[PDB]
């Protein structure tokens, strides 16, 4: 994710991309069953569909 | 819990013209007797003119300025082996704690008679020795050592 021009306007999107990178990285560092993968993924999708609509 | 508590007012003494002197005379009071502490403090004043000839108000404000603490310490724990948190305190409590330190350290010394011990206390407070400035320096040194906790706290 290479984006930076002068001082700070890149940094806000840097926080956004860092947040999504952390989101994607947390669920590939602790092991548990595949059924848990599927159920948690559906739970997250339901959260996105209910909050962001 | 409760709500914000208003404070009762303290009137300045219209002879040396300083309300901090009134807080001096209040804190150094025991048994609820303004007369005895008043005579003690005024004898200490007379001693201030007696040796190290200088304005008692000037040495008073110098002692206040030297003894005042920059930061305070607040307790916010999570589990066993609690951890301190240094926070910011307004000037009113800062001078209150400075006066409290002067009062408590004054009645902890040699030179048994109260007049000379309190006079030496105010002299040392003006001159920045280990009588009270040591305690303030210590409480400052524990601060900004774990300032990581101070930055992220509540």
């Amino acid at each position: 994710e290479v984006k930076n021009d002068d001082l700070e306007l890149a940094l806000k999107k840097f926080k956004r991309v860092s947040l999504e990178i952390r989101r994607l990285a947390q669920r590939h560092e602790y092991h548990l069953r595949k059924g848990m993968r599927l159920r948690e993924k559906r739970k997250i999708a339901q959260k996105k569909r209910r909050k962001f609509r | 819990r409760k709500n914000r508590a208003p404070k009762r007012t303290v009137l300045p003494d219209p002879v040396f013209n300083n309300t901090l002197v009134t807080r001096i005379i209040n804190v150094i009071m025991e048994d609820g007797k303004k007369g005895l502490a008043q005579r003690i403090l005024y004898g200490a004043f007379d001693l201030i003119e007696q040796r190290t000839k200088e304005k008692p108000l000037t040495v008073f404000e110098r002692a206040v300025g030297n003894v005042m603490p920059r930061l305070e310490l607040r307790v916010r724990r999570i589990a066993g082996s609690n951890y301190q948190v240094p926070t910011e305190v307004p000037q009113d409590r800062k001078i209150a704690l400075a006066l409290r330190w002067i009062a408590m350290f004054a009645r902890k010394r040699h030179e048994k008679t109260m007049l000379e011990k309190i006079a030496n206390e105010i002299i040392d407070a003006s001159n920045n020795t280990g009588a009270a400035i040591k305690k303030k320096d210590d409480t400052h040194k524990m601060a900004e050592a774990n300032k990581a906790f101070a930055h992220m706290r509540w």
Binding site: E1, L7, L24, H28, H31 | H151
Partner: protein, 114 residues
């Protein structure tokens, strides 16, 4: 002895490391929370990472450092304090990028602690 370069920082959940490097891949100097006096559990704080980044910026200033890329690594709450340290240091930072050791869904990681 070089103007351009890259400095890497890896904010682990338990610690942090910062390292200034030349574009050739060699390191110039590194710093970490352990380099400072305080140790133990108290080293995983954003303030510690901030002071480590301050020290590494200081010790690269004498080298004559100039415009520099930034690759931030690891996950934690202390990585952004290094950004503040470097921006306030007046250095000539030019580009930001993300270089966590992110894998595809391959090898099995450790478990749920419980």
């Amino acid at each position: 002895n070089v103007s351009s370069g890259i400095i890497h920082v890896s904010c682990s959940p338990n610690n942090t490391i910062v390292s200034a490097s030349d574009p050739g891949g060699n390191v110039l100097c590194w710093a970490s929370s352990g380099t400072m006096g305080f140790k133990g559990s108290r080293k995983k704080t954003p303030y510690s990472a901030g002071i480590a980044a301050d020290k590494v910026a200081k010790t690269v200033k004498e080298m004559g450092m100039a415009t520099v890329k930034l690759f931030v690594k690891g996950t934690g709450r202390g990585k952004d304090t290094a950004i503040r340290s470097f921006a306030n240091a007046g250095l000539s930072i030019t580009e930001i990028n993300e270089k966590t050791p992110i894998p595809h869904n391959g090898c099995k990681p450790p478990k749920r602690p419980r």
